[PDB]
Scaffold this motif. Structure first.
Motif, PDB file in Angstrom:
ATOM      1  N   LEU A   1      65.717 100.655  49.760  1.00  0.00           N
ATOM      2  CA  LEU A   1      64.357 101.268  50.411  1.00  0.00           C
ATOM      3  C   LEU A   1      63.991 101.225  51.722  1.00  0.00           C
ATOM      4  O   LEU A   1      63.695  99.936  51.989  1.00  0.00           O
ATOM      5  N   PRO A   2      64.090 101.877  52.883  1.00  0.00           N
ATOM      6  CA  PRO A   2      63.635 101.708  54.174  1.00  0.00           C
ATOM      7  C   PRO A   2      62.256 101.733  54.394  1.00  0.00           C
ATOM      8  O   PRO A   2      61.473 101.856  53.585  1.00  0.00           O
ATOM      9  N   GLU A   3      61.809 101.395  55.553  1.00  0.00           N
ATOM     10  CA  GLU A   3      60.444 101.364  55.998  1.00  0.00           C
ATOM     11  C   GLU A   3      59.740 102.456  56.207  1.00  0.00           C
ATOM     12  O   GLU A   3      58.346 102.418  55.918  1.00  0.00           O
ATOM     13  N   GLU A   4      60.290 103.531  56.364  1.00  0.00           N
ATOM     14  CA  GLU A   4      59.748 104.970  56.610  1.00  0.00           C
ATOM     15  C   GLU A   4      60.558 106.016  56.162  1.00  0.00           C
ATOM     16  O   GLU A   4      61.767 106.020  56.076  1.00  0.00           O
ATOM     17  N   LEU A   5      60.017 106.799  55.537  1.00  0.00           N
ATOM     18  CA  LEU A   5      60.883 107.986  54.781  1.00  0.00           C
ATOM     19  C   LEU A   5      60.047 109.161  54.202  1.00  0.00           C
ATOM     20  O   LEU A   5      58.994 109.074  54.058  1.00  0.00           O
ATOM     21  N   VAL A   6      60.694 110.326  54.516  1.00  0.00           N
ATOM     22  CA  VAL A   6      59.930 111.349  54.447  1.00  0.00           C
ATOM     23  C   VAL A   6      59.747 111.671  52.562  1.00  0.00           C
ATOM     24  O   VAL A   6      60.813 111.488  52.145  1.00  0.00           O
TER      25      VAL A   6
END
Length: 155
Positions: A1-6
């Motif tokens: 899971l990254p920090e920013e995501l659509v």
């Protein structure tokens, strides 16, 4: 899971755990759910001292539409205090989507004990996400709590 995501592109809805929340945008969001205003510097202080500040923005140029805020000891325990979604976007599953990303972020940070204080009308919502009230009869207690007209969970 990254920090920013659509999360979705209906307009984009962007999730972030970066913690960039402008206190005036947050004030306006809390206005929409009826919170009495509090000193902006004490809101700012609560934010910088919240281990996890997770946001939803509508990106058509950004508009804050949701936030989840948790404190933690950075090791063992976290408490999710506020979960707020803009009333204009409620009914669309965004509170649930935000909570899944919040939980995943805390687990990735190896926080094992994740807690919250659910008002009566959202207990079932969190139960469905895997929260359990009063495990082993443990009670959430408050020191001389004031009567709360306003609620800390909006989805």
């Amino acid at each position: 899971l990254p920090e920013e995501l659509v999360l979705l592109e209906r307009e984009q809805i962007i999730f972030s755990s970066a913690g960039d929340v402008n206190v005036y945008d947050l004030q306006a969001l809390c206005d929409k759910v009826g919170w009495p205003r509090r000193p902006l510097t004490k809101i700012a202080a609560s934010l910088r001292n919240s281990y996890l500040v997770a946001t939803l923005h509508s990106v058509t140029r950004k508009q804050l539409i949701g936030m989840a805020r948790a404190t933690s000891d950075h090791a063992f325990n976290a408490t999710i205090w506020d979960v707020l979604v803009d009333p204009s976007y409620q009914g669309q599953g965004l509170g649930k989507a935000l909570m899944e990303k919040v939980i995943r972020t805390l687990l990735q940070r190896d926080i094992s004990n994740i807690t919250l204080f659910a008002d009566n009308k959202v207990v079932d919502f969190y139960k469905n996400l895997g929260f359990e009230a009063d495990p082993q009869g443990i009670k959430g207690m408050f020191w001389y709590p004031r009567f709360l007209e306003h609620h800390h969970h909006h989805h």
